[PDB]
Amino acid sequence: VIRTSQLIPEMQEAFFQCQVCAHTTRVEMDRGRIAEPSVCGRCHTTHSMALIHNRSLFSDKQMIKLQESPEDMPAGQTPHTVILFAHNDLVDKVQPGDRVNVTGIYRAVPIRVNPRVSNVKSVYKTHIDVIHYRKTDAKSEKRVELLKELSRKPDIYERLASALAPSIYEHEDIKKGILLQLFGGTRKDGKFRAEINILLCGDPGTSKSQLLQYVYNLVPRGQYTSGKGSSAVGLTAYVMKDPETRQLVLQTGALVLSDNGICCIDEF
Amino acid sequence: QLYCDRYLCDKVVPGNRVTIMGIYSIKKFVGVGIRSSYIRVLGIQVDTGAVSPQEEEEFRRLAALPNVYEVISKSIAPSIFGGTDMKKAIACLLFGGSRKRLPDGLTRRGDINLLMLGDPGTAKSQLLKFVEKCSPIGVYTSGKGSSAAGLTASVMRDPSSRNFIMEGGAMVLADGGVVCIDEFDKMREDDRVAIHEAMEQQTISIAKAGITTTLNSRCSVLAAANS
Amino acid sequence: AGTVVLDDVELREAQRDYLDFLDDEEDQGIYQSKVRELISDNQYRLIVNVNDLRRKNEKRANRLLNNAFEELVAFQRALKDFVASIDATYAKQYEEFYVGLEGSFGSKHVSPRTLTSCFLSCVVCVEGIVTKCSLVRPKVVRSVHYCPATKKTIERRYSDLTTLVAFPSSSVYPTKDEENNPLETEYGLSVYKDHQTITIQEMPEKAPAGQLPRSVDVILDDDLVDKAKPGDRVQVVGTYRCLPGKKGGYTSGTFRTVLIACNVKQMSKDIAKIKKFSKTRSKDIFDQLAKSLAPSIHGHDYVKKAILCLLLGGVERDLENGSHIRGDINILLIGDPSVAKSQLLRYVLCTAPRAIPTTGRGSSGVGLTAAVTTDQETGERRLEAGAMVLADRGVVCIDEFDKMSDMDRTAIHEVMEQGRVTIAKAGIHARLNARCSVLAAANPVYGRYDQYKTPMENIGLQDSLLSRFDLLFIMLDQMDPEQDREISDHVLRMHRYRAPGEQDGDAMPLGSAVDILATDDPNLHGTKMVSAAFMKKYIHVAKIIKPVLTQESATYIAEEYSRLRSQDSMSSDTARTSPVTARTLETLIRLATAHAKARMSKTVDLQDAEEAVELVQYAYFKK
Amino acid sequence: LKDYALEKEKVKKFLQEFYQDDELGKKQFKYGNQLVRLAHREQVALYVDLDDVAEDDPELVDSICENARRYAKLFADAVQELLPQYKEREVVNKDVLDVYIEHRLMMEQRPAELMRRFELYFQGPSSNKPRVIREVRADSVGKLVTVRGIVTRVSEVKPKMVVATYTCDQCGAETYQPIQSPTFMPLIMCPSQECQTNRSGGRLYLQTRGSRFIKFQEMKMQEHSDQVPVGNIPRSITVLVEGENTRIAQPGDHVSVTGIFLPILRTGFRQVVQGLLSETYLEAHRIVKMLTREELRQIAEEDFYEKLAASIAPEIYGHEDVKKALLLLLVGGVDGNINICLMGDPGVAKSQLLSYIDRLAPRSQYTTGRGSSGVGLTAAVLRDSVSGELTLEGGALVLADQGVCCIDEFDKMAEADRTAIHEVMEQQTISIAKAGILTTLNARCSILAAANPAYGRYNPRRSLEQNIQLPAALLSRFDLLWLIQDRPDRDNDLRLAQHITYVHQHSRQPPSQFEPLDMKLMRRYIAMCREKQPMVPESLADYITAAYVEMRREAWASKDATYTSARTLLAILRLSTALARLRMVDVVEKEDVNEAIRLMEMSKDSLL
DNA sequence: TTAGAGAATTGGAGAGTGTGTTTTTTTTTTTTT
DNA sequence: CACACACTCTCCAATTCTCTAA
Ligand SMILES: Nc1ncnc2c1ncn2[C@@H]1O[C@H](COP(=O)(O)OP(=O)(O)NP(=O)(O)O)[C@@H](O)[C@H]1O
Ligand SMILES: Nc1ncnc2c1ncn2[C@@H]1O[C@H](COP(=O)(O)OP(=O)(O)NP(=O)(O)O)[C@@H](O)[C@H]1O
Ligand SMILES: [Mg+2]
Ligand SMILES: [Mg+2]
Ligand SMILES: [Zn+2]
Ligand SMILES: [Zn+2]
């Protein structure tokens, strides 16, 4: 998924009211166009029925822009992309960056040459009406009962610390410190931080970055970013024009996004 | 805005002081009833390409008398006490040498470049302000207030048609005369290296935004600076 | 639009006069012969000399130049009659036979500045430099439509304000029969013609004092649609017209003016016995040419030899594996103030073909390579060539090269290394050819060269860039009184010179349109220094010789390359200007090839190899 | 000009009666045999060859070439009128439009262009020599032309409406609208007599199921750079491709397109404004793109490893060590990339290796790190502002995706590109914002870097990062760091100069008195040797450990503990597995580990 | 008491008139380098 | 420019009112 639009309301039933006598009627949607009443029924005035927008009925719609997977692209080619349209409950189930198997009906629709003229291009636009989404990159008492006795097992501290990052050769006190950072103190109120701050030092080519990436994959509300100015997501907060909308958005940095977690800062 | 017509076209150039005689009028093909105004020029008096014969023969007389060099030098900045050698050099700068093209096509500069450099309160700025007013073609600019583009020539797009055009700087506006660069020590070095070609070769070679040309900048540089 | 009625009586009189002019049989047969060649070469534009038309019929020539359109259609109809008389089969291949004009046009010779509204409807000859070209696009002149319901073909012919026709014409493309049936275009049976717009700019050296150069738009059609490209100095003969426009029931009386060209002439590069006699009679013609190269600059003999090698160029080699060796020779001059670097660059600008001026602070990378601009005709964005692209198969002279930005020199890296520049802008990702020699001039850091610092820190440029130049000369203002005496003698002699057509007290005139014929009117040692006019033609003929390398000269070059490598080894880190590499060997091959071109030898001899080795020795091993 | 009614019968006679001999002098009607397949829907595209037409009517060929589109329509009409003569089987309906047409026919028993499911194209005559794009002038409008060029942009295949099918809601009748123009007016109200006479007010609903679509694809061709004139920009032409001609060509492909050169039709306000001028496109009609026993007996020679390494750079002497390392670059380790960096003075045969490996590699690129004015190491956006559509170009790293990217002057790479190299070497992809929206590109490629010292010649007195001025975060990603030294050396210089002078005076490599393997044989060998996927045996783990620790401890004892890490062992294993692939054995062994260790040690020896 | 023939009023078909449209580079300036 | 929308006016004929016969 490359982008996901704002929620688009699609009219399902138009509500008309007579501006002369307040008599109301309802019109059903015929393949995207309204059969507007040209006359009122109670009275008989012509062109008196006005569309009451917020008494009409609407349903959710959303546009999604979906790129072919990197694992599926042919060698050295720029990726292809399709447009999906989801409606009702399937609208708010997919975010940008997700990988999905989408089942839907492959539609083809005309596009008018300019908005005030009904001539259409011979070459049709295509999109997929979404019928089903399946995410394919996602990866209680029965746990509490295990954890209660495992907590009173001997040297559970050492067991958890050694469980941290099995893929690297062991630095006992580093792993112990990261474990105590994960658990943290107790937050109470005055103003004292329960958060624990840890710093790792060493040459490039040490296991410090592997530790950072591991615990970022582990912890909830985690973040991973570089102190270098070329980082994917910044540490500080900033304001930017949302390019697909042009309206301002306050992008709070990783330190604010990790307000109840661990912020991993590589190249500090 | 001025509308000129028939023989009033090319009667003036930028930098000229004029007295315009004309009809104040609206264009006739921010607000509602707003109309853009201009003057339809009916006459131009350049305040000051021709000398009357009386001026001409008087100039012959003035050149003929034997102490014309001393008379000119005493005419340079008469309100300034002293500095006779500096005034004489300024007279030489005002009159200039002779430009030449040699048989192989190479050009030799004719204009004279003069730098005044040193103590404050020594009337350097007054000499520049005199020379800018006395030279037939003359522009005064501060070194601090100038840039490379604004001195030589600048490239910019026109809102009326999306294409890159050139606009002349100080050197182009003073082509055929003198540029009086006051505060010459204050300008940036990157801006100061812009005028080397225009000082010696008396040309400005621009290659920017696709437009590639070589303008003329046949002008003297009279510069004032401090230690 | 475009249809105009003409008086048939004067049209027939003019057509009679022009057919009499073209039927040149009883006289020398010049235009009989030219129309025969027009038929034979499969051409349909005849270039007529108004000098000949004035000799035969002076009043008709004057009326032609002052009443261009009606007289030109009369002339073209006469030409169609005459070509039909010679070959009636060939006359039907083309809808119209065109006439372009050459010769002297009197007062109609103009520049874009003096081309005022008084010249509208006249034939004018405008001399200038091309600054823009649009893309060649087809223009419908005659469309055939097949009506499938009615089973008949209609044929319609068109015109616009640009295309004045003197026959009835439309300007609306039909889509329905008179019975309201649909019409199908027969594209193959329709006729279209190529159309392009260019802009001709005033020569900058001829502009008045405070002024920027002015411009005129030119419309080229048919064979003329790609006869001039940007940077060409050209003479365009055509009819000067205004285009009366309208905008929704209203017109501003301001009309744009265009030159509808009828003839385009280049002003560059345009018998063998004198050159053959020169190469056979002279001993070391390379030396005579080199010392004759820039007379107004005293000394700098080796630099003049190197610049002559740059002008002659090496030979371009393409190998069976697709690897490539450039023929262009690149020269860098680092030196003190007032050692004539700029004047040498200006000489090469004045004398070489397609020599592009550039300076470090006056230019940018975009202007050096290529820019996005919008075609004013269309509005679409497209590329516009920069200086090094315009300099393809030519020279770019970069003065003040040390003052240039590194970001600007990034482009010069690709151009010098590979002879190309790659771009990704507008709708186009492309590889433009920039096969140009570079003649760069720079000052050392600290202005004046410092004897108590190494050459590689006097030269402010990095060795990666310095590797691109074949030759690197250090030019020092040695204050030896002997050289000062002879240099000052030469300089004062130059400053005492005056031209022959000029009085003793004359100040230098500002330029004007003094060229008043489409071809040169006046048209090997000096008036034993070689003449400049001869030397231009000689270098033109010598550039195309393409001599082959010979085995003994190759052996000599190999021996001397290995010896130069040993000298590089023994040299201290202060006693060299550049290290010796395989590119030094390539430089030796290129310089020997250029010397062979100077001799017009067709084979690289030991004579060439010796001078190449001497020049490389001189350039490389200095401090 | 001609009577098209008679021309259609001439075309029918050609299609029915032309014959050619294919095998043993047997006579076959090449177009009747294809009309049979067209009638049976076994074949959809019919490429009629005007070289075949020339064998019995050159005048018809001239008429077709001079008025091609008219004759294309005539040939299509003739073929459609001929297919019922060649019907002899029932069609298996596989398109939903086949099913709809089947029920349409049954209901008619109870739209010619609609019933027409085939497409006819002229394969150009050989007398028409291929033009360049610049030579396709206005005189050739409406005429069959062959044009050579570089494909530089290709759109996705889109559905182009040919015949719009509608259904009425009131009278239950189908309505058909053939579409010739690039735009059309949709039908709103039913034109049937039953609705019109009754004033029924019944409207029309488009049925895509019943309508006919055709595959459509726009592309841009560009001039060959060496064919452009000296001072000029390369010209470009739009080619509109339909049906079976779609998907034949991709960007970067050298193509020759036979087609019809036509002006673009305009609607609304464009025809008002443009006047007599028109843009043009080429209507594509045909697009053309421009060991095991015998050499195994050669490969059986024990030379083969050194034979390949010698063939990797025959113009260079003494560097067989480096050539073997670059062989392992091309082979790659077991899944896997192998990255190499070469350091040396400017003006040395270090770019020669980049050139050779780029030439030999099947998928490759060869750029420079010095901030290209084109598409850089990473992707870039093009606006195409005749229409304004943004489009994405790959760059070096993306265009060398499943191969090798050669980077010259790797040190002068800016930080914006160094971060991209980090992205490639860490996770083998790059990411770019097209219009504020971010798209991800594959780059699963091995990097062959060549750096130069920041200032002056190389100086072993200083450290490597001091020489090159590039951080250890870059330098540690590489598997072999080589110093390609160059000293003056009299006899070697003499031989190099003799070699280059022979190359100049003969335009060919001198006889070296060695027979290297040809480039195609080398390519087939590397594919055959990289098809293998070896595995390291567990019994060799102790020996790998011993070699790694002794190399590590030698670095401790003799070179002040210069940097090494676990990626050193990983690089040794990747090199040994690449050697196993090269030897075409699916088990790694002592000799592979020894040679990997030796290769790393000699690269460090070149540094020291 | 229904309904049908002649006269007048209202519905709407259609003829006529008017409106709107088809990333890029050089330069400055403050802050940050 | 010229090809679609948007809006007004006019005429034509179809329906309903009025007066008469079945
Ligand atoms: N010799 C003089 N005769 C008359 N006025 C003088 C003289 N010297 C200085 N002044 C006056 O001193 C003031 C400063 O003159 P100015 O031209 O600015 O000198 P300056 O050398 O340019 N000063 P500075 O810009 O600090 O170097 C003016 O009001 C002059 O009139
Ligand atoms: N050897 C010479 N013979 C004749 N004229 C010379 C010589 N050296 C310098 N000149 C003259 O000195 C003037 C300045 O020359 P110029 O071409 O600017 O040298 P330059 O080194 O390029 N100046 P610069 O840009 O500061 O380095 C010109 O008028 C030259 O003709
Ligand atoms: Mg002052
Ligand atoms: Mg200079
Ligand atoms: Zn109502
Ligand atoms: Zn219907």
Side-chain angles (χ1 to χ4, degrees), chain C residues 235-262:
Chain C
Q235 258 176 325
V236 181
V237 186
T239 307
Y240 192 53
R241 279 207 280 274
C242 62
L243 305 178
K246 54 184 289 296
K247 191 78 76 173
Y250 197 82
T251 182
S252 53
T254 307
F255 301 160
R256 72 184 287 253
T257 55
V258 288
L259 179 70
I260 298 91
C262 72

Side-chain angles (χ1 to χ4, degrees), chain A residues 186-201:
Chain A
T186 174
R187 198 177 294 170
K188 49 188 167 189
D189 181 20
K191 191 52 59 176
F192 159 83
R193 58 173 173 88
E195 308 304 319
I196 288 161
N197 294 323
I198 309 294
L199 175 58
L200 275 54
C201 295

Side-chain angles (χ1 to χ4, degrees), chain D residues 334 527-534 580-581 584-587:
Chain D
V334 153
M528 183 176 288
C529 93
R530 299 156 79 273
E531 88 201 353
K532 307 216 79 221
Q533 200 60 204
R581 284 153 64 79
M584 300 183 165
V585 61
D586 59 354
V587 183

Side-chain angles (χ1 to χ4, degrees), chain B residues 16-45:
Chain B
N16 283 16
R17 256 192 64 157
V18 291
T19 309
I20 295 297
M21 191 101 165
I23 314 178
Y24 187 47
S25 52
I26 50 146
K27 285 188 180 178
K28 296 173 75 186
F29 299 161
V30 68
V32 278
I34 308 306
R35 300 287 172 274
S36 186
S37 66
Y38 72 107
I39 290 168
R40 182 186 152 202
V41 182
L42 304 180
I44 304 173
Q45 276 173 323

Side-chain angles (χ1 to χ4, degrees), chain C residues 137-138 140 184 186-188 194 226 317 320 392 422 427 429 433 462 464 559 562 565 573 581 586, chain D residues 4 66-67 70 137-138 141 153 222 225 230 235 279 347 374 409 412 457 486-488 490 493 504 509:
Chain C
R137 293 168 183 98
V140 66
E184 292 178 352
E186 296 285 308
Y187 297 104
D194 306 301
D226 290 313
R317 207 80 70 192
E320 73 284 27
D392 183 63
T422 310
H429 164 44
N433 300 308
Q462 61 209 334
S464 170
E559 172 55 34
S562 62
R565 289 270 283 176
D573 297 325
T581 60
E586 298 289 357
Chain D
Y4 300 132
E66 294 290 309
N67 195 6
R70 170 57 59 191
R137 297 291 180 82
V141 166
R153 167 153 63 262
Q222 194 189 98
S225 63
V230 294
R235 299 275 172 78
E279 295 296 333
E409 191 100 310
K412 282 292 188 188
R457 287 72 51 73
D486 174 49
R487 282 73 54 91
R490 193 72 148 99
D493 299 329
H504 265 284
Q509 184 216 285

Side-chain angles (χ1 to χ4, degrees), chain B residues 124-126 182-183 224 226:
Chain B
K124 301 184 296 303
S125 324
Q126 294 286 24
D182 210 335
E183 305 298 339
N226 293 121

Side-chain angles (χ1 to χ4, degrees), chain D residues 361-375:
Chain D
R363 295 189 189 91
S364 56
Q365 290 286 281
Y366 181 17
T367 55
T368 74
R370 206 185 294 94
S372 175
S373 187
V375 194

